[PDB]
Amino acid sequence: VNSFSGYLKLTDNVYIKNADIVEEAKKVKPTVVVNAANVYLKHGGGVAGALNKATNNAMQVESDDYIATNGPLKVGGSCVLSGHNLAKHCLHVVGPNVNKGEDIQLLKSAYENFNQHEVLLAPLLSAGIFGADPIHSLRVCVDTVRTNVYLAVFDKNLYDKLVSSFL
Numbered sequence: 628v629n630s631f632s633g634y635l636k637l638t639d640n641v642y643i644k645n646a647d648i649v650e651e652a653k654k655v656k657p658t659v660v661v662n663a664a665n666v667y668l669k670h671g672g673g674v675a676g677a678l679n680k681a682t683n684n685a686m687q688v689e690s691d692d693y694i695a696t697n698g699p700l701k702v703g704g705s706c707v708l709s710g711h712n713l714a715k716h717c718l719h720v721v722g723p724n725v726n727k728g729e730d731i732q733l734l735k736s737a738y739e740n741f742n743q744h745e746v747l748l749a750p751l752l753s754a755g756i757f758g759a760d761p762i763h764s765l766r767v768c769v770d771t772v773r774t775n776v777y778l779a780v781f782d783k784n785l786y787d788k789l790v791s792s793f794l
């Protein structure tokens with residue numbers, strides 16, 4: 628038993644809710660919150676901008692030190708940093724950005740990072756400003772992630788579509 632509340636169960640291990648991931652993180656304090664990161668960990672907008680804003684820019688300060696030491700992530704890759712006031716840890720995962728021409732097949736590799744964590748609160752990778760089809764992202768999630776994932780979908784209209792079209 629865990630503290631996540633109000634989720635619709637899609638599969639044995641995947642759950643989904645219409646929620647603001649920032650508000651959900653502040654209430655649950657999960658072990659892991661997933662950020663929709665880019666390779667530079669520049670948290671300017673979308674999920675990343677909202678998570679970073681909720682940390683009062685501490686996420687960005689930590690991220691800049693990470694990049695200065697390690698260089699950029701790979702598309703499809705990830706790193707574990709602090710969750711600040713939102714979670715114990717933040718798993719920064721780089722899904723392919725369609726608006727940059729990145730290969731959508733890398734979406735499966737991106738979701739594989741979730742398997743290193745027993746339970747996660749996460750957004751749909753490559754959705755929103757990353758330009759992928761969220762229905763496709765949900766399908767890849769269900770077919771790739773084997774650990775317990777609680778998906779927060781900000782847009783109510785999208786949440787209902789995602790639910791109604793789920794196979």
Ligand SMILES: COc1cncc(C(=O)NCCNC(=O)c2ncccc2O)c1
Pocket residue numbers: 754755756758759760761781782785
């Ligand atoms: C590319 O295919 C698509 C099909 N249908 C919908 C989308 C989409 O992402 N729509 C934007 C949904 N809104 C939000 O996520 C949102 N989040 C936070 C605050 C306010 C907000 O409106 C994409």
